[PDB]
Amino acid sequence: GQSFEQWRDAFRQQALAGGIDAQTFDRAFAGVQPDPAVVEADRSQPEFTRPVWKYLEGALDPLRVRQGQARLAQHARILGEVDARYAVDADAVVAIWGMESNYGSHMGNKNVIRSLATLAYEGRRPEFAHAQLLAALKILQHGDVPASFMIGSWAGAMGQTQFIPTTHNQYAVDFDGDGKRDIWGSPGDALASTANYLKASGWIAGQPWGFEVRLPAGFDYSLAELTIRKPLGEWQGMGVQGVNGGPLPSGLSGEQASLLLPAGHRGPAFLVLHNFRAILKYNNSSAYALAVGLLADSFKGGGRIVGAWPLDDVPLSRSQRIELQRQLAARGHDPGAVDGIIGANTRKAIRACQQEFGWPADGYPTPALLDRLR
Numbered sequence: 001g002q003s004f005e006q007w008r009d010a011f012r013q014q015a016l017a018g019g020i021d022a023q024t025f026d027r028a029f030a031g032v033q034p035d036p037a038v039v040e041a042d043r044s045q046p047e048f049t050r051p052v053w054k055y056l057e058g059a060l061d062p063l064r065v066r067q068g069q070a071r072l073a074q075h076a077r078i079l080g081e082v083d084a085r086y087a088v089d090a091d092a093v094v095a096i097w098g099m100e101s102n103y104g105s106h107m108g109n110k111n112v113i114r115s116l117a118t119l120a121y122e123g124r125r126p127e128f129a130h131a132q133l134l135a136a137l138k139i140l141q142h143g144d145v146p147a148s149f150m151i152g153s154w155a156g157a158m159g160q161t162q163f164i165p166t167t168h169n170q171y172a173v174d175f176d177g178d179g180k181r182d183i184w185g186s187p188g189d190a191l192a193s194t195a196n197y198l199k200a201s202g203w204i205a206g207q208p209w210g211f212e213v214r215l216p217a218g219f220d221y222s223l224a225e226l227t228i229r230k231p232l233g234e235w236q237g238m239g240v241q242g243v244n245g246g247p248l249p250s251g252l253s254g255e256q257a258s259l260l261l262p263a264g265h266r267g268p269a270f271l272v273l274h275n276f277r278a279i280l281k282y283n284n285s286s287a288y289a290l291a292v293g294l295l296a297d298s299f300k301g302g303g304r305i306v307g308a309w310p311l312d313d314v315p316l317s318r319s320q321r322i323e324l325q326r327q328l329a330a331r332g333h334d335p336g337a338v339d340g341i342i343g344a345n346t347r348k349a350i351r352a353c354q355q356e357f358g359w360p361a362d363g364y365p366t367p368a369l370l371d372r373l374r
């Protein structure tokens, strides 16, 4: 519709046909008008971004480590019961909780119905918004939370877990008691729901998400790529060692693993296992899943990185990622569609380009590489 009212009146029909009670809709939409801060966040294609280095210093702030240790002690009975019942490690659940909402304290400020209506009406990704808005009305209909406290982030990620509405509907859990899957006010529900999703996402209890490794010299950096998986024994068989030299964890010999270089060949290296992929389903950013893994390790005093972070290391803005893709295509190394997104297709082109220069083929775009291309 042209006006918000027109869009709303039209969407009301679709909600009714999909099972929303008329009074659910009207309590949900009472007071609702488009929210320009949500339109701006949706339009923000973050030019200046990361580096993973900075992002990790946020994630792993000792304030958040210690608050996470307090939460583990404060909710230990509940966490024992979740860990036991879902076969998901308490440390991983608490780490996700810290990453997503700082253990309940930064859940976000926006009404989920308003945010998702705004994005359905005038956002870049209206089909997502429509789908999530409908699912969100079902949640209000079932009674998990009153409309007024249905809070979350500008994109509709809700409560303490930052579930989107369709994920809530399929994975949220009522840990007590009371008929409500309340991921907003109930730590029990929230911890149990995160665990449930992690378990559904492949989590194996007691198994490490990954660990830092030492790469031997003149290592083939081509194999650093999450689409490439090899057994731990076979990485040991190309010389990948524990982080202070020596063997890799025994018993894991057959675990599929990938090699992760979040700051290229001069930064630290990690082998990441199945549980890292579980985390990626929760949030499909390798920087996030690494943060999560290290935060969880930090609650027990681990999470320490042996290899230094490159001092140079400056993240490419959205503009210069697009420029890099264009310069790549112009030298015969095709990155695919010029989308400003360094995926597996671009990395493949970065690597062929790095090889042509005699550089290590980590597939990690640097400001220095963008210079050689001019």
Ligand SMILES: CO[C@@H]1O[C@H](CO)[C@@H](O[C@@H]2O[C@H](CO)[C@@H](O)[C@H](O)[C@H]2NC(C)=O)[C@H](O[C@H](C)C(N)=O)[C@H]1NC(C)=O
Pocket: 058, 059, 098, 099, 100, 101, 102, 106, 107, 108, 152, 153, 157, 162, 283, 288
């Ligand atoms: C206090 O530190 C901030 O904590 C925020 C809550 O943990 C976090 O926002 C979360 O980021 C998640 C992944 O990074 C994302 O899935 C959640 O949706 C989001 N939570 C909310 C309510 O939006 C902050 O991280 C973002 C990326 C930021 N503004 O930097 C985090 N901020 C920092 C500097 O660490």
Ligand SMILES: CC(=O)N[C@@H]1[C@@H](O)[C@H](O)[C@@H](CO)O[C@H]1O
Pocket: 157, 161, 162, 163, 164, 167, 168, 281, 282, 283, 284
């Ligand atoms: C915890 C949660 O809801 N994570 C969702 C993930 O399930 C979904 O595949 C993706 C799609 O946008 O967005 C993430 O935030």
Ligand SMILES: [Ca+2]
Pocket: 173, 174, 175, 176, 177, 178, 179, 180, 181, 182, 186, 189
């Ligand atoms: Ca409940």
